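Ticket #4471: complex job returned nothing on first submit. Input attached below:
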Amino acid sequence: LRPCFVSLIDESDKPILIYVPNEAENEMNDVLKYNVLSNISLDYFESALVEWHSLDSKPLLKSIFQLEGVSVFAMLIKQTGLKIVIGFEQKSLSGADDEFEAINQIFETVRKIYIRVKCNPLLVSGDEKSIIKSLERKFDELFISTEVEL
Amino acid sequence: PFESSSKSDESLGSIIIEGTLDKFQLHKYFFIRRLRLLKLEDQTLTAFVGAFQLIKNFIESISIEYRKSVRLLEFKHYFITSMLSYFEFENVSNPLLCEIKAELLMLKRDNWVQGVMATSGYRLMDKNYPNSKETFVDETVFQENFLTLTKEILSLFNKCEGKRQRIVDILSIEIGLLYYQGKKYEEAVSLFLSCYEYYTQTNWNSIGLKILQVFIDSLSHCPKGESVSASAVLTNAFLNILKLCKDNDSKEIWWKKFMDLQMKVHLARANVSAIEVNLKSYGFPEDISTKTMRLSLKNMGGDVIVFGASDFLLKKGENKLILECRDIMYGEFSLLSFEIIVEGITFVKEFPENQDEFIVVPEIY
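Support reply: We reran it on our side without changes. The output follows.
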């Protein structure tokens, strides 16, 4: 219900943003664990004969992993070479299938948010700086800041 | 007379859908072990990943209530007896170190067990145990001894597979705590700390920004292509590119020249802080070529010694400069005082030869 990071990598194996929620206002330096978890999943693209992909129609939620306190996976659409991944904190994890398809559909919501901000020509040549802040500014309300809506 | 694996998966799903019992998933574990012994000599390992998913669901069944060694010790004990993934099939010329990956994940589970359950210190400085009895590590120095023996035996044994470059490109690049847990001068462990730290600089940053933070303490108070005096300056003075904060924490901006303040030999650099852009080159007084150059500024200090160059189609002309430019702001009018003209700018003089900028360590561009 809350991701522990958000990571974005394009097709050249360059990480676009390894975003971590709440690194200010709360605990630091586990972001140093978070990006190397992302790099473990980056060179753990396909290894030791474990295949995540069998359906080529829509890229669904692929194989779950669990490593040293988090629960990560991958969702390779194979469309424009986008390789985005999401982990979850295992300490609050119920492990159901509506949870599993729920994180599948919120993975498609963050896919929607990236493909919306990918083609916003209100500012042009937004490719290096404050595109990142803008997409972080669109990240940080879809999973949190629901506390005052009621 | 037989039925295929689809009936096995559907019978496993139907045995999962059968409910209301009060066992510790022994009805699932029976069919999981039968599918495991049906899934051994296939040379496939995908059903071994399904067995890993069965181990993950068993870990979630133990992790429904497991905290503070009241039942966290029970979950770690159930995983240590669930190390029969390592103790069922273990053979050479197998399907490429899937057992080594499973033993690496089980070693992570055992490291989490030792670093949990009223434990002291931190092998990885991890704190993977959040807020919530095999007795293998009876001392804190023995906790480092029994785990660095574990994390080096299981490091390159997973590299015996097809070439993944996955764990030992990162975890054997994570040998910072292998000797700099407390021992200062890591000259013995200098094979990956201050030798090939650029493999995350050439990759995405802020991983190497802490790897280089402990790749200077092997030379901050330690003496004596492993021969240098201050020639480890690409990690010391050219670490300002990954140092995003310079105006704050300028000890990454003081020690770039304070290492050279008692220097003495040259090297190369990218000049990726101060960019340089050309302009309209004009004419000047007698035998003065005098090109026009604009230079950016992101580094702090000044008083350079530099020249520009422009090769012709045969030989370099090296259209020089005043070499006292003292670059403080962006796009400033660099003088580029140039003599020894190669035939009056003969139009094959294409500006390909670089514009270096030396402050006893050269910066080509």
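Strands of chain B lie at 276-278, 293-295, 332-334. Closing as resolved unless it happens again.
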